[PDB]
């Protein structure tokens, strides 16, 4: 009856160092909508983050978009977690460039 | 622009 | 084609808070219009310039109609619970989209109105714009109510008429972005796993409107059941990104090529490693 988000965690330009950009966390294909969404900068949740507005697909099922604008560097390292009904702990995936 | 005519209640 | 859309959510929250009601409008792949129960005055708001425009009226007419269906799906969703016999203590969800399909000569294609609860089908108006499929015994009692009260003529005025109406609208004022077609950026990108096979994987970037398709081959032949495909993503900047992967042996990435179908492409697009 409900249904486990896939998580996507990207930059809306390709990266480069010392380069303004955003970081983004897309949460799709969940049910129910009641989802908590954090960006994680070194494992520190980055305040203000933006996000889109509730809609779902044709299956019925919800998406949204969480952004930051951030300057990626070699080192600082960045990641998404995400809390669903559907999930046993917090789920966290890294930002990976590629 | 969203579909105000009448109430759509189940 | 071209489509105008209509994405309304209503959740019961007891013990936080009254019920959510979050509508959101889209003409194609375009957010045009937001309006959120929880925000501190509700209001419909602007999403794109091309409705930034619009003078008063139309504004405080949306806000007026989306104060209408808040408060009829927080009658709603106590109306369903009653239907199922189900306990005040759950939260539930009540889903409703519709809109309309103009076909690639401009004329109305398809329109639509249905409705989940929880997830999960409970009725729809039929493509004659006439009649019910209800998917349970509690939806058989909403179809019976709007049968009675003649509903699907109110919905079909609108899908057929007032729903054609603003979607040519706001293509005419919107027409800048809404008419344009943006190709996808393409590139490969070669990632070792072991000394002995390789991901390529195949990468658009850039691109609108959403609606894609990418593949990889091998000597020619299509390898379905081989790649791994990520669901479109926003870009978050009005555009879309999307890419396919493969594992190859080390030594054979020269056998694969990646094919790329878009709108905004004049021809599909072939790229090697």
Redesign the interface.
Known sequence: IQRTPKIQVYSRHPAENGKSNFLNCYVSGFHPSDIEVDLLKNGERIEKVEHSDLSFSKDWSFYLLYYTEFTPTEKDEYACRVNHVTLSQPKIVKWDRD | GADGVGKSAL | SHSMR??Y?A?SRPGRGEPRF?????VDDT?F??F?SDAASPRGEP?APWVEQEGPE?WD??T???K??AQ?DR??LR??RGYYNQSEAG?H??????GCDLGPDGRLLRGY?Q??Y???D??ALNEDLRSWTAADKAAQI?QR?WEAAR?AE??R???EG??VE?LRRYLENGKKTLQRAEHPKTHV?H?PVSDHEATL?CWA?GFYPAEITLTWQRDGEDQTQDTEL??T?????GTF?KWAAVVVPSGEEQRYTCHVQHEGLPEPLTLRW
Not at chain 3, 93 to 98: F, S
């Open positions: 209509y994405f959510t959740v979050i509508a959101v409008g889209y957010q219009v937001q959120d999403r139309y007419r949306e007026q109609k989306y209408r269906q009829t009658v709603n109306k369903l939260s969800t009540l889903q409703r989209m519709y109105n409705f989940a929880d997830g999960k409970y009725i909403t109510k509903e109110q919905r005025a609108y899908l007032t729903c603003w990108t990632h994987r970037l990520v669901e993503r926003p870009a978050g900047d990104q």
